Design a protein around this ligand. Structure first.
Ligand SMILES: CC1=NCCC[C@]12CCCCC21OCCO1
Ligand SMILES: CC1=NCCC[C@]12CCCCC21OCCO1
Ligand SMILES: CC1=NCCC[C@]12CCCCC21OCCO1
Ligand SMILES: CC1=NCCC[C@]12CCCCC21OCCO1
Ligand SMILES: CC1=NCCC[C@]12CCCCC21OCCO1
Lengths: 217, 209, 211, 217, 212
């Protein structure tokens, strides 16, 4: 009837009003600073090792990367907006961290829509699915001990004074690993590292993804 | 000329004169009907366990904000529009290995009751072991489709049939289809209280001899 | 004077047509449109018998005619036509029905508009499509076919036509790996069980063999 | 010097003013007409034959194409703009000619920034570097006389009544040709042609690039 | 605590607005610019002797300085630098002179601006370029070279320099198929027949062989 449709129009109007208040009526978040640093939580879900090229020492992974962070500027009171407690939004409408693989050999291919979820406490969750080619020698992959490769993920432009990274666990989520992959996973870890480079006095933070794998027999 | 003016006026009223639809919510949910028409298994790569399908995916949904009265617009009952002018659902394959390649123009049909129909043709690479494809029983592969970001409380999926449409399947494909089904599934994940919905596409196929 | 005036007249004409008139929203059942299609086949680049895909290079002449693009040349310094970005105008959504890869566009997206309202648009394309090349290494060669038509409009909104059923082969690459034995382009009226309206396509049929 | 700093500020202000006068304050050039035709000068500099594929009869060239033309609407008096005699601008800010290879088999890949130089007399110079795949039978490439291939370049949509082409020379510039290419160049010419096609009563102009090449020994 | 954070954000938003929304057409003969280049070579991924193309992965440090990007930190809560989209600022059109494919960009297009007006931009890239790998399976290895410079500006508008002639090899992939015997980056001044003005490039010269 009318009243059901009216409720739906009101819920839409509340959401449109909330997004307008947050985005159109506030300068966009200029990113973290030394005085206002930000912690980004990263977690990997490895779906498949698609290919290991021993002629070029490149390996191709398919995974999704959970990214979470929290901004005061994205907070609201649900009671002021019809009890809206979260919403979906284009990743282009918000600031997102510039988390980059440090040893890719090809631009990352994006396999999922660029949409994030924002919650009323200001927390953002963004889960890009990706295919990554990275530097990896697959020697030993046809052996019982398998091959080991590693790739670091972190901000390309922010030091540890502006962006800290963490993981919720050092165990990579392997529960959705493709059971009929050409490669089986012996272990996969994701470990926060504090790095010093000779160029720079400031510390840099990365998450090191280490995968040990071999040919499935 | 009046029919053109009426259509231009209708599109202007819907699009230019209404704040853009922010997507479905718990309070304003949406059902998307999905159906597959499989045209070709182009390639089955046993060196990487990837298979490439060509298909078109019929997507239908309905928005109150896209409704109009035909009598107010010269008895226009529907129109074609760029898919960029409207909200579209983020239906995603859960086990692709490459970005989907779009093979058809990004245009939808909107009807006066607010229903939208959008039929993207696609080439998809997905995770699939083709072992057995050179046998009578063939190989079986599966891939799930659903929203990447919305739970079942915002977007429900359904199919009109569990039979994949094979009436357009390429007769000289390298592979013949033994069966193809499309089935709604309700899943829970430990992170989350809400249900998640997918459609599971299951294809059994073998080398054409 | 004259060259400055011809420029000024053209700028004025384009402004009058584009900036000062609501844009054509496409055809409808009440206001249907004829689109003429013709193919010029330049090259069969590749025939892959491991996947049954063939790659063609061709250009597709598309013609249609709109009242809203008409003008009187006498009101615009005897300008009888002009070139314009295909993004400035409506263009038909003509699609191959059995491609296996996105079409690669090889020419600039520019159309010619004439004072009688006729539009001509000639996109050059590389297309991979479903094709079994069995027989290509024989005297009789192989035969493949691909249908082209609107993706979203029925025969009640867009009627598709050809000026001839002969594909233009006068630009076919003489040192191609493949020679063309015949190439035809034929209008077809199709009924599908989903739908009461007729659908129109042009069926491109190419018979070819190794040179 | 403070005067030196002031001059620099003024030169910047003058250039911004000039670009604003030309671009923001004038209807954009709608292209040539039968009454107001345009001559484009083309020259090719061939850098490399990268690949000659005899399984598909496609050859891949890397070259840059100098394009020059002149518009009355891009003229200014240097004395009105602090003696600015030219400027660099994004090729997206100006009209550029639709010069197209007639027998490419793949979209051209652009290897250089899309920036042109405009001079006060209204002349424009634009030098896109490109990788082109085109139709070419490389039979004979492993012989003393080598293989010969040809590709025509011209407007896709304008006849010779609206766009004329010319070359300053019929010799392709070979002074940048890669000395350790897989292929050596025996000759490379660029020749203006006036062509009649049965479709069309107006004549069409192209520049025919003819390259004779063989495997380097 | 929260107020300080809001103020630091407001100061940065204000600084970016002052610099960008409330004010560079590129260098000119009257207002020339020096760009410093340095290369960090990460991997020789592939050396194709059938086409004489080699593929490198590296990052290229670019540095330059503009008066129009200067500010006083004391007027903006002691902000001494900030990160910004490379689309918000002018960037130099530094181009490889002998690429055979469009460069693939491997890093986000974000730069760091410092209060003295200096900009640092470090694009990571995969480049295919013209290179004969003959001798790569020998002790002396192969040598290839590629020049980088502006595509549209002469030495009257853009000068280049390097901070060192040694390419940074400290990030070179230890299990690459190729080992680096040497890698240098050298400024060159060129005169061409077409043109009276000088042209500047940085010549990257790499000697490499199969890891054995
Ligand atoms: C994090 C980062 N981004 C920009 C360039 C590469 C890198 C990481 C590798 C070493 C140098 C580096 O530069 C500055 C600090 O660290
Ligand atoms: C749709 C989706 N979104 C982001 C994470 C991955 C995935 C898809 C694979 C299974 C878990 C999942 O999450 C919740 C629902 O389904
Ligand atoms: C033109 C078209 N539209 C979108 C779906 C696919 C197709 C073409 C293949 C057969 C069915 C079809 O649908 C209805 C009419 O024709
Ligand atoms: C330049 C051009 N434009 C569009 C189609 C192809 C071509 C070139 C090959 C012959 C015909 C042609 O058309 C008109 C005259 O020239
Ligand atoms: C820098 C540059 N720009 C565009 C064309 C190619 C090149 C570089 C190779 C020699 C000629 C050249 O032009 C002028 C001087 O330098």
């Amino acid at each position: 009837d009318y009243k059901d449709d009216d409720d739906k129009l009101h819920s839409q109007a509340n959401l449109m009003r909330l997004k307008s208040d947050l985005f159109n009526r506030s300068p966009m978040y200029p990113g973290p600073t030394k005085d206002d640093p930000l912690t980004v939580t990263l977690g990997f879900t490895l779906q498949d090792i698609v290919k290991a090229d021993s002629s070029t020492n490149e390996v191709d992974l398919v995974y999704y990367e959970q990214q979470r962070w929290k901004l005061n500027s994205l907070m609201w009171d649900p009671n002021e907006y019809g009890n809206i407690t979260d919403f979906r939004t284009s990743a282009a409408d918000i600031w997102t961290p510039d988390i980059t693989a440090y040893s890719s050999t090809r631009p990352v291919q994006v396999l999922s829509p660029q949409i994030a979820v924002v919650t009323h406490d200001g927390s953002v969750m963004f889960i890009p699915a990706q295919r990554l080619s990275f530097m990896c020698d697959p020697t030993g992959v046809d052996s019982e001990e398998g091959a080991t490769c590693a790739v670091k993920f972190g901000s390309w432009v922010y030091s540890g004074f502006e962006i800290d990274l963490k993981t919720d666990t050092d165990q990579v989520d392997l529960s959705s690993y493709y059971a009929s992959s050409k490669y089986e996973i012996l272990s996969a870890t994701q470990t926060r590292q504090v790095q010093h480079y000779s160029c720079c006095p400031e510390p840099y933070i990365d998450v090191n993804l280490v995968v040990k794998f071999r040919e499935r027999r």
